[PDB]
Design a binder for these strands. Structure first.
Lengths: 36, 785, 73
RNA sequence: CUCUGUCGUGCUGAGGAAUCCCUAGUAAGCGCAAGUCAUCAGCUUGCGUUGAUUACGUCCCUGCCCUUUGUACACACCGCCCGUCGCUACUACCGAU
RNA sequence: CGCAAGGCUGAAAAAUUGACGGAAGGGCACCACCAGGGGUGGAGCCUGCG
């Protein structure tokens, strides 16, 4: 188990769910809402 | 588990580092020790050698008004002060980051300026032992220093900088060479002139004379050019007569005389030397009518030349206590009393017990040396292909044999019985010489780099250029086995006293241990940071340690290994160059190690914060007003004697100090701190707000904390009495400051309106036609929802 | 640095007349650094600073109110 | 649990240093029931009943996380955080081949 | 069925983006402070863990 943890950490692949943007549908480019 | 220690070190006169000094003694720099010779008799007087330091020494300076104290500058950035009476270091100075390169002393000798390669020049006091200050100019390294007080320096960014010392900032700069580098500095002893030697062989000449206006001190009075176009190492002036010596790192030293600048300076003489001179130095002997120019070469020698002032003669020389170029091989006697060292150009054999040379021969190049048993004769295999034979007791050359044609004898090994020698060369063959008569040859695939026998004369082992080792039988030359697995060609090998182990040193930065029955690698052990030159076993197992071996490499290290437990038992430092050869004793009690160093060696709270700052400023105000009353009474000497925190922060006003301590805090913390401030601390704050509004600075901050003070204490102010006086003062001052600032900004905005309307009137239109459609900023302003 | 810029701008306007600063013609006047946009930027930031100092004066009459109360007592 | 009577401290003794946990139907007392493919009768899990003291502030101690890059624009405020090295580009130096 | 399935061999880097910190300022925590409460630890029984 310890060697499995060390292999994942070194060649780092983690199975955590990642924080996605809440407006990925309507704003897919992710533009910034200020001066353009 | 007995370790090794440095006990002896010799074979060296002046290194390739700079700065020779004369005192009739010559004080020069060996690697880490500064050693002083007599020039008349070749016996050295003394050596200055410190156990705490290992780094090499590279700058020497004699103190004026007191010889027998000297300043040496090392490679790690330290300075030591030695005495010539007693060989100790009285004071040590660890100020710089790297590589002290130019020293200088005051005229009175109480002050010492040291300029480094890390470009700092630091001046040092010699009665308080404190780093005085740190002068900071100079894009890159400082190559010249002098004390004119005043300082005159020059750097590798081709700038002469004239520094002050009473106010530690530069007064003048000038640029000596336009697109080159100023490399050397020479000052006249009466401070009338300075000549700076640059990269092209051009010598620029400057005249010196002895703040709000245009200060002009250094004047480029003209340029000179010497004969050789090399980077000039030094310019040394005569302390008494009218001469100087200019030299680069070459075989010529050009002595010019002082009578356009080309008319003022003419070359008196050009002195040729036998080797490249690193540092020239001047010497005046009592009772002679001459110029004793003392050159110290890169090729390991001192020469004292006599120059007649109104030709050169090689008057004195020191060459006997050192090899002159570079030791390539060592071989020490069977009686272990004397050793031989074989260098390019020479053979010099030495005594161990006295560390003084006994015999000297001349050979062309010297790859490999080994003496024959009885230690009467020595064998040298050279680069030109030949094998020379010399003898010690009559000190002569017996025989010479063209072993290979033009192919360097890379390996020589004497038979353990002592009747034959084997020379393996840069040709494919390896030849056997019986005594000498050629007995048998061995043709093999590539060039033989190194071969060694067995201590019981049973098997031979050659080591090729094909990154492989061939172990043969000694009687008939049949291939017993071959060892592989080296990525780069084998440089050396040594096999054990009972022939059960081989160590094999390669250029791929590791050594291998083979078992020599079946030739299995015991353990490949990566142990050096560079290509390991040589290896050697200790031959006697009388002391119980015969499976230990030394390995010397290009990373300036020897390593003591154990092959039985496969472990490094010691790391031997102490060499400052790529160690070319080493040998162990037949008793094994000491070993010699010969380097590129040319030195062969022998080894045996926010509110409380602003409140206390308010109190500091209040005491400062009381002291300043008392000093005002005193200086109004009389102009007598009256010191204000304010706080050491103020005279360390730089004699700032108390207003500036309390303004900075009010400015440092973030605005929410400012609100909380002024809330936490008590009413005993309020009146001091009100006086300082009066001071801010009087000498207007941060008027919004002043008004902000003032209105906070009044609003959080409104009843207490209108009940107290002295707040009437100080609040009337702050009202008058703040109203004047606000009205002044407001009227200035109103004049500005009115003028900008006027000039904008006039610019519109200029801009409007020239033509008139039917289309007035020719006659605005726009911003983008994205928004997501 | 707004006070030091306003003070040396005041010295600049009091030294030179308006016709010179309007007919100012310099070869580096192209795009965002031309004279119109430069004087517009200076004017609008000076408007902001002047609004700040006007609010400060109007709030600064509190000290005269407090001195009037202490004069009453 | 509430109320009313009969007798009166009688081997008939509420846990040290430490260490841990706990802020409202929470701590604590009390019984009744069930026994659910793992665990649990030397107990487990539900369910009702009675129901407080003291904090509910502060980063001072012990820590943990994060700012000093970004992610929006008006008012308003701030105003170039600091060190030891690496890597890259160029410049010249040192000395063997 | 064919390939995989022939031993210079003998166990224990990337980087103009990187490595490590410090000072200041915030936020949070019955693994923190503060105020209290309650266990365990004393005697006996016993599941379990070593």
């Amino acid at each position: 188990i310890e060697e499995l943890i060390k292999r994942r950490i070194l060649a780092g692949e983690f199975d955590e769910v990642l924080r996605r943007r809440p407006d990925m549908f309507g704003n897919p480019h992710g533009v910034r809402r200020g001066l353009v | 588990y007995l370790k090794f220690e440095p006990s002896k070190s010799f074979g060296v006169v002046v290194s390739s580092n700079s700065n020779l000094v004369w005192s009739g003694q010559a004080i020069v720099a060996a690697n880490e020790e500064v050693l002083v010779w007599d020039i008349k008799k070749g016996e050295l007087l003394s050596r200055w050698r410190d156990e705490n330091c290992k780094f090499r020494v590279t700058a020497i300076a004699q103190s004026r008004t007191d010889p027998d104290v000297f300043a040496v500058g090392y490679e790690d950035g330290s300075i030591r002060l030695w005495d010539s009476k007693i060989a100790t270091s009285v004071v040590s100075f660890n100020g710089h980051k790297s590589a002290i390169t130019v020293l200088a002393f005051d005229k009175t000798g109480v002050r010492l300026a040291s300029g480094s390669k890390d470009t700092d020049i630091i001046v040092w006091d010699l009665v308080a032992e404190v780093g005085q200050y740190k002068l900071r100019g100079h894009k890159d390294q400082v190559t010249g220093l002098y004390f004119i007080g005043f300082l005159l320096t020059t750097g590798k960014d081709s700038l002469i900088k004239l520094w002050d010392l009473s106010s530690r900032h530069c007064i003048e700069t000038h640029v000596a060479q336009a697109n080159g580098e100023c490399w050397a500095l020479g000052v006249s002893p009466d401070f009338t002139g300075c000549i700076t030697a640059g990269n092209d062989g051009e010598i620029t000449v400057w005249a010196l004379d002895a703040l709000s206006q245009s200060v002009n001190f250094l004047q480029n009075r003209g340029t000179l050019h010497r004969s050789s176009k090399e980077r000039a190492a030094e310019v040394v002036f005569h302390p008494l007569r009218d001469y100087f010596a200019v030299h680069g790192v070459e075989k010529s030293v050009e002595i010019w005389r002082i009578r356009e600048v080309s008319d003022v300076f003419v070359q008196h003489v050009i002195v040729r030397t036998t080797g490249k001179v690193r540092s020239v130095d001047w010497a005046l002997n009592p009772g002679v009518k001459d110029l004793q120019l003392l050159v110290g070469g890169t090729n390991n020698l001192l020469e004292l030349y006599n120059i007649v002032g109104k030709d050169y003669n090689k008057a004195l020389a020191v060459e006997l206590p050192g090899h002159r170029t570079d030791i390539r091989s060592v071989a020490i006697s069977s009686d272990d009393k004397m050793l031989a060292s074989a260098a390019n150009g020479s053979l010099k054999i030495w005594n161990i017990k006295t560390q003084q040379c006994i015999r000297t021969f001349d050979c062309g190049y010297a790859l490999c040396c080994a003496f024959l048993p009885g230690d009467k004769v020595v064998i040298v295999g050279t680069k030109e292909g030949e094998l020379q034979l010399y003898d010690v007791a009559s000190a002569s050359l017996l025989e010479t044999v063209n072993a290979h044609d033009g192919h360097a004898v890379w390996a020589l090994q004497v038979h353990p019985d002592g009747r034959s020698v084997v020379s393996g060369g840069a040709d494919k063959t390896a030849k056997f010489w019986d005594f000498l008569v050629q007995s048998r040859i061995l043709k093999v695939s590539d060039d033989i780099l190194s071969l060694r026998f067995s201590p019981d004369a049973r098997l031979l082992a050659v080591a090729l250029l094909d990154s492989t080792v061939k172990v043969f039988f000694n009687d008939t030359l049949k291939l017993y086995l071959n060892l592989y697995g080296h990525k780069l060609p084998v440089l050396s090998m040594d096999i054990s006293y009972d022939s059960k182990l081989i160590v094999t040193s390669s250029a791929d930065k590791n050594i291998r241990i083979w078992g020599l029955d079946f030739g299995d690698c015991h353990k490949a052990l990566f142990g050096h940071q560079d290509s390991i030159l040589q290896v050697a076993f200790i031959p006697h197992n009388s002391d119980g340690n015969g499976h230990y071996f030394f390995s010397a490499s290009k990373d300036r290290t020897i390593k003591y290994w154990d092959a039985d437990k496969f472990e490094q038992i010691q790391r031997i430092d102490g060499h400052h160059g790529e160690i070319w050869a080493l040998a162990v004793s037949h008793s094994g009690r000491f070993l010699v190690s010969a380097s590129h160093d040319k030195s062969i060696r022998v080894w045996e709270m926010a509110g409380e914060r602003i409140a206390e700052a308010l109190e500091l400023g209040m005491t400062d105000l009381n002291t300043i007003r008392e000093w005002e009353e005193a200086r109004q009474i009389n102009p007598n000497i009256a010191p204000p004697q304010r706080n050491p925190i103020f005279v360390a922060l730089g004699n700032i006003p108390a207003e500036t100090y309390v303004l900075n301590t009010l400015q440092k805090i973030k605005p929410a913390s400012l609100h909380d701190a002024l809330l936490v401030l008590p009413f005993s601390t309020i009146p001091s704050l009100l006086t300082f707000l009066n001071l801010f509004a009087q000498r207007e600075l941060n008027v919004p901050l002043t008004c902000r904390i003032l209105f906070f003070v009044l609003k959080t204490h409104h009843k207490q102010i209108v009940a107290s009495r002295t707040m009437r006086a100080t609040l009337e003062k702050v009202r008058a001052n703040l109203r004047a400051a606000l009205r002044r600032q407001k009227d200035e900004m109103g004049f500005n905005i009115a003028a900008l309106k006027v000039v904008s309307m006039q610019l519109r009137d200029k801009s409007v239109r020239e033509y008139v036609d039917e289309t007035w459609e020719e006659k605005v900023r726009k911003r983008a302003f994205a928004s997501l929802s | 640095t707004a006070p030091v810029a306003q003070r040396v701008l005041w010295a600049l306007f009091k030294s030179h007349p308006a016709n010179k600063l309007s007919s100012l013609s310099v070869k580096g006047a192209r795009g965002h650094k031309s004279l119109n946009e430069v004087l517009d930027a200076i004017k609008v930031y000076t408007e902001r600073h002047y609004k700040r100092i006007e609010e400060l004066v109007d709030e600064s009459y509190l000290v005269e109110y407090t001195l009037r109360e202490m004069d009453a007592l």
